[PDB]
Amino acid sequence: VSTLIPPKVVSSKNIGSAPNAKRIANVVHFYKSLPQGPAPAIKANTRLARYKAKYFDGDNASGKPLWHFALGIIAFGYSMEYYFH
Amino acid sequence: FSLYTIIVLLVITSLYTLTNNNNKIIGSRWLISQEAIYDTIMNMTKGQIGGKNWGLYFPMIFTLFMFIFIANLISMIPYSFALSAHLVFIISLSIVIWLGNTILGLYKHGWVFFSLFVPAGTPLPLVPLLVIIETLSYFARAISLGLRLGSNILAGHLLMVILAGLTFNFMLINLFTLVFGFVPLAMILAIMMLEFAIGIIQGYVWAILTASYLKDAVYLH
């Protein structure tokens, strides 16, 4: 004889179907993350890492590193050809 | 030649390892140069071998694709890395690919693989001729893959070499120091832009042909 109780029965009722499914996905995606640009890790110098933080950086990454690599390759090849040819 | 083949390994290993500053989702300036080619590869592979088992049989076509296109790229440096002017490796691995798709067909189909050389519907009095018509072309297209890439790359390498060697009297003693006397340099530059174009296009088209042979192998037509 008791009336229905919508706001009293919300323990099992969630927000539709998709919103409750994505609530767990969105609650923790924003929890454990850097606030703003933390840990840049820019500093690196290990020849390969020296190239990474010197010319191979993605801020520009223009053809200048490629031209420098080609210049070094042809400089080595000149001596190689002198040895061979 | 061994040290020169390691160089292309180092350059394309650095394509991602020496590119991503922090492995950002937005992508670095050289991560894009590889994800774009990956997108193109997945696109025309699902276009050509579209259906089941295409994903399982995509990766080796992909690997051949970068192999060939950076192999063509290194042929731009003036001491051109055109396989050290030997280029027989292309033929050997073309034969390898032919054996690979032959075994693919022989395992996926077996006796049905012999029906790959005959189409679905043929006239009865004319099938015994068309079977041998379609067979020898299939066994023969094991050098056609090699001579294509070999042709383009080393033909370019030796034509620039020949033009450079033929350019002896252009400015030292010849009084014509204009483009009339500098035709060698002009056609050298034109044929090098042509070389870059044909290298990239031929890498893409050989990817297409290898995907087509794989489609002929794993499926029946």
Side-chain angles (χ1 to χ4, degrees), chain A residues 1-22 24-35 37-41 44 47-85, chain B:
Chain A
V1 84
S2 154
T3 75
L4 318 93
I5 34 165
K8 148 75 162 207
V9 182
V10 81
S11 310
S12 166
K13 182 242 176 229
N14 236 310
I15 323 169
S17 272
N20 54 266
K22 63 213 294 281
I24 168 178
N26 57 59
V27 61
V28 303
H29 266 223
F30 312 134
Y31 268 170
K32 38 212 185 285
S33 151
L34 79 175
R47 166 149 263 278
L48 298 112
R50 176 257 312 155
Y51 219 156
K52 187 108 191 210
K54 183 197 65 146
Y55 266 55
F56 271 6
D57 210 90
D59 70 283
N60 55 287
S62 71
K64 197 70 71 73
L66 309 183
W67 307 332
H68 287 9
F69 197 90
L71 173 64
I73 284 310
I74 195 76
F76 161 69
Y78 255 115
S79 85
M80 196 23 47
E81 203 78 276
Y82 295 155
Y83 164 60
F84 253 92
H85 199 71
Chain B
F1 175 79
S2 37
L3 72 157
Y4 306 134
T5 51
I6 297 155
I7 282 156
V8 315
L9 263 295
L10 161 75
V11 173
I12 80 156
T13 295
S14 62
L15 169 36
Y16 152 75
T17 61
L18 278 191
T19 285
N20 62 106
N21 301 326
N22 54 86
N23 208 15
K24 49 202 170 293
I25 297 151
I26 194 60
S28 211
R29 183 112 202 114
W30 280 315
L31 299 179
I32 48 157
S33 288
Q34 57 175 128
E35 49 82 40
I37 79 181
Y38 167 80
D39 255 327
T40 59
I41 293 306
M42 52 156 297
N43 285 316
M44 31 48 60
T45 38
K46 61 175 59 38
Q48 188 286 323
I49 38 165
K52 63 192 100 163
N53 76 273
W54 95 267
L56 297 83
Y57 284 80
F58 144 79
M60 70 320 303
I61 318 287
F62 189 47
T63 57
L64 201 73
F65 179 85
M66 319 65 68
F67 153 41
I68 61 183
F69 95 80
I70 309 85
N72 301 355
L73 278 169
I74 42 151
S75 288
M76 183 46 257
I77 195 71
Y79 279 34
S80 173
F81 281 49
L83 295 102
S84 301
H86 91 286
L87 302 102
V88 313
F89 200 70
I90 308 305
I91 299 83
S92 38
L93 53 69
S94 90
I95 305 153
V96 155
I97 291 151
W98 190 98
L99 275 293
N101 34 70
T102 291
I103 301 155
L104 249 67
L106 209 73
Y107 185 43
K108 169 77 207 303
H109 302 285
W111 335 109
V112 172
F113 174 61
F114 309 128
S115 321
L116 198 73
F117 323 127
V118 85
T122 70
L124 261 297
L126 286 72
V127 50
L129 316 180
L130 66 91
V131 286
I132 77 147
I133 285 295
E134 285 174 45
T135 44
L136 70 186
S137 47
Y138 167 55
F139 333 105
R141 53 198 200 216
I143 187 54
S144 57
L145 313 83
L147 39 63
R148 203 165 332 263
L149 288 320
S151 66
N152 328 290
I153 318 317
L154 72 93
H157 187 168
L158 293 307
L159 44 57
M160 52 204 168
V161 155
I162 276 159
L163 292 167
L166 259 171
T167 322
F168 26 80
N169 197 32
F170 61 99
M171 202 175 108
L172 286 81
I173 315 303
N174 187 36
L175 73 100
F176 304 112
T177 66
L178 76 157
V179 84
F180 158 62
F182 279 11
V183 175
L185 293 89
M187 83 201 130
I188 275 173
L189 72 92
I191 206 57
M192 300 338 316
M193 31 164 49
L194 267 282
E195 183 88 338
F196 153 72
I198 168 175
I200 64 111
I201 302 161
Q202 80 189 254
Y204 184 100
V205 72
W206 200 28
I208 279 164
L209 329 167
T210 58
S212 88
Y213 306 138
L214 209 160
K215 144 83 60 184
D216 302 331
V218 294
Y219 307 105
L220 201 78
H221 68 298

